[model samples]
Target: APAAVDWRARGAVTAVKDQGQCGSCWAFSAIGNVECQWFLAGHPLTNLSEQMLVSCDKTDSGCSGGLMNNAFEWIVQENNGAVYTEDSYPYASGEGISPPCTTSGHTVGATITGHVELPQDEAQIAAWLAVNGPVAVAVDASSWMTYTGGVMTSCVSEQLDHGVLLVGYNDSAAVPYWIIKNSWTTQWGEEGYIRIAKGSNQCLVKEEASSAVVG
Candidate 1:
């Protein structure tokens, strides 16, 4: 396997997006996985709608909190395997109030057959990520408030309350790290991304890793 992998460098990943004040990180993390998976499946890199899940996913509490796994199930089982384009169902939960679900006048961007929960082992997750495009993951970002830059080597390893995307990693770095894309916009971390120390499960990154299977 390669010593390092960055989907952004390979053009399989999209630009970092902001989730704003809403507690919709789960939606962002889920949609981000679909965006990259769709692109890796030979389709154009398109932005999908996170608002669709926030507003329409009855299993997930809109603008509140949810699980990425639940969102994936809703898309495949409840939504007929369709995800709307961002331009059609623009994100309206930045202010923390999700508008009522609307079904018409939307464009479908991508679809998925299902999702797979990655192995809990860090080495296994990294190996899977090296082959897959990207993986949706949950982390305890409670200690990320003062994060400025550089590889994060210390943080709480439990209580994963925030969702993010794992895009790349460098196993050969002096301080090996996992490249993660955050939903806090470009102003936070390293241009909307962060590198956490690898193999140690920093921020609980290895706890809940998963990805959608593009169809």
Candidate 2:
């Protein structure tokens, strides 16, 4: 049998605003992963609320920080569906908010069949993209607060407090680029997204996890 495929070709990065001192990186990562999935599915750019996951998804601790994998599992196992627009579910900063028993939308908007661990090879990353719309990968980012622009070179620490989405890559640039969407706001990076060196040691920690959308 032929390998399954994700029809979306390009991925876009987004700024999933920090949960403001809340240990909801898992929720951010979860929502970030799904946001790209919708975009890949030809859904118009709509704000999929992360607050639903932060408030409703009970499998993962909201303020204690959890793994991205757990969030994906919650959607698959719990029958949770995709989140609503920002207008419907606004962003909440702190962890004091009460968890809602039910949400207005599905836990996940797409059908996720399973998850995959990506190999370190760049070719492998490309191949994975061909099959999956976008993969949630983690990286070592520290003192990244001062990061202004240009190609990121100095990667020394591994404070995985933040999460980003990898949409696409461009080798034609002066430096090979890994297109990333950030959540720090449009003013933070290149319009809430950045292009990091593709082969730089920074990319050394890149790993693509498996996820899918049900049409």
Candidate 3:
């Protein structure tokens, strides 16, 4: 059964970007999550630049990697906010940029509270989803590039990579699964998103689990 969620209305169509080889998956997930919230609040769907977070946010380590929750904290408490124009910051191949500050941008507003770590189970996940918005989760996406869709059930356990974002889940399908958005190109999975077997820890977001809302 689909979890009884408040169904917090999500806003405009926000574009998802592929972090590529850059280990900065955390930044993409953090910014993407907040951006959606801002849009839902009737704010224009401004593409907040992850490059700004990668370059400015001291918490993040360019390619070395960082946690999405940490990035969210930096945006909410430290930096005034986050915002970016597509022209000012263009998305590049993850491997195209080397660290040490590669781009420039601005912060917008703080809308997130902090972080919450929920258990890795269907009921727990559903409860979390009911309360929070979208979440950043780590999944076994090592085979992401080659994913062609159709209920991703079988994959080598060894082939797992840390990805982010928990868009939502629905039992409306023949086989229930969590609908996740990936950083891979749009053609990779179900248009850059994949449905994983529900009630599993395939997509895990640990300790500092934060969500955003725009007022």
Candidate 4:
């Protein structure tokens, strides 16, 4: 692991946030990538609102299901748009509105100019994450449910049902894996993190590599 990237140790990454029982992993994953970009761009680490996308982004419905790409496009619709923090518009299933279609007087945190979809190259994505920030990735995380790993080989699934963050990489390692940030919280694999085989796109993770472009 020669000078390998580790966003968690650098304070650029925040505590693992959970998506609860919500199927909105797409929003959490998109927000995870955005948070890192915003911080690396010289802003304080902020808990961005998944609720904003969950409610406002009509193309992608709240809780029911969504995609990271749609979420990115929505962020760019209102150039440098104000994104509320989770604290102001927290993820509430029962106590608060199911979708939180709107939040009055919510504090504005970070503003992203747009987002960039990266080329599906493991090496390129690795280099980008090392400098720019984490990227939102869609992976066949079907096997992740029971995974507690060393290095997951059976990580992929037939359909991509989840979204995760490609935080860093350990290219020099024996297995050569990509460090991933999961929204399952610290309760799951490697304290909300995991490592999957690289190069061959182990879990179709490199299929839709992308990052939030902060202004």
Candidate 5:
């Protein structure tokens, strides 16, 4: 694997998104993975909908909380593998309210056959990311509220309560960190991105690493 890889520099990542008062980080994380995967699969980098999962995925608790793996399953099983564009089904759960799932009038932006759960190892996950694209991962964002900038060398890995995107890694850096994308908007944590120390299982980032398989 390369010493460093950044999908954002390659133009596979979309702009930062805000989940607001709602706990819709799972949706953003999964969709961000899909957006990058779809682009790597010879498609345009398009912004997909998070509200689609927030309101539509019955298995997940909309603004309450959710799992990225379950959201991927819902897209394949219920949505017929069709991911709608953000322009058509714009986000509405920012105010902590989830609207009823809409079933029509949205344009298909991307498609995925299924999802893949990477091994619970940072080296293995980084290898896969260097060859593929961005990955969806769950982490313990308990100490993230006070993070301002720079690489995070210390954090809790006890419980995985937040979902985020692992966009890249710089193994050659002095700290050797993984670049993570957060759903708390551009104003938070390195413009909605965070660099957590790699190889130490910082924030349990390697525990639940996964990605959507684009076709």
Candidate 6:
């Protein structure tokens, strides 16, 4: 495995997108992972439609709250186990209200064969990320609403409430932190990114994890 990796640096990550006031972070996480997998599979990076999951996925509550697992399963089921880009479907539910489910002018933008779930081992998870692609991880964001920047040395909890992408990590810094890409817009954290302290399971980010397989 490489000593360090950052998908954003490799142009594999799409620009940070806003989930707005809705609780659709899980959708962002799933879509982000699929985007990374598609890119690493030699496909161009594309903005995927989170709204598709928001309105269409019946297994989870759209916008109110959802699960990363549910979103991935939905992605594996919808559009014949494929997903659509934001350009084709477009997101229309950022205003805190979900629009009716629609698939009128949209089609498959990328396809994922399936997803692989990771166990609760930190080091093993990191190695899996290095070999696979970006992962959709569940984390406790209870204290994240006020996180300005820097490694989260203190703010954290055991319960995982938010879903975000594990884009990459920089372990050689003064304080090692996993570089996490959020869906709260570029104005939220370090240009929409935050470094959570590694090793101790700061937010229980690696507690529940999975990755998309684009083939």
TM-score of 5: 0.98
Clashes by residue pair, model 4: none
User: Over the full model, what C-alpha lDDT does candidate 1 score relative to the true structure?
Assistant: 0.93
**C-alpha lDDT score of every prediction, in listed order:** 0.93, 0.60, 0.61, 0.80, 0.94, 0.85
- In TM-score terms, candidate 4 sits at 0.92
Following a full C-alpha superposition, what root-mean-square deviation does model 3 have from the true structure?
3.7
Which residue runs of candidate 1 sit more than 4 Å off their true CA positions?
A: none
What TM-score quantifies how close candidate 6 is to the native fold?
0.96
Ten-residue stretch with the least lDDT total in model 4: 91-100
Ranking by lDDT: 5, 1, 6, 4, 3, 2
Give stretches of model 3 more than 4 Å off.
1-13, 83-87, 102-116, 130-132, 155-160, 172-174, 203-209, 213-215
The RMSD of every model to the true structure, in order and in angstroms, is: 0.8, 4.8, 3.7, 2.2, 0.8, 1.2
User: Best lDDT goes to which candidate?
Assistant: 5
Better of 1 and 5 by lDDT: 5
Off by over 4 Å in 6: none
Q: Which of candidates 2 and 6 is the stronger one according to lDDT? A: 6
lDDT of 6 by residue, 1-215 (tens): 56677877778899899988898888989998888989999988888889888999989898888987787788777656778888988888788898989868886789888888998877788888877768899999988998888888885676888889998886777877788999998998899998988888888876898988888
TM-score of each: 0.98, 0.75, 0.77, 0.92, 0.98, 0.96
lDDT for model 5, please.
Answer: 0.94
What lDDT tens digits, residue by residue, belong to model 1 across residues 35-108? 99999998999999999999999999978899999999999999999999999999998888889999999999
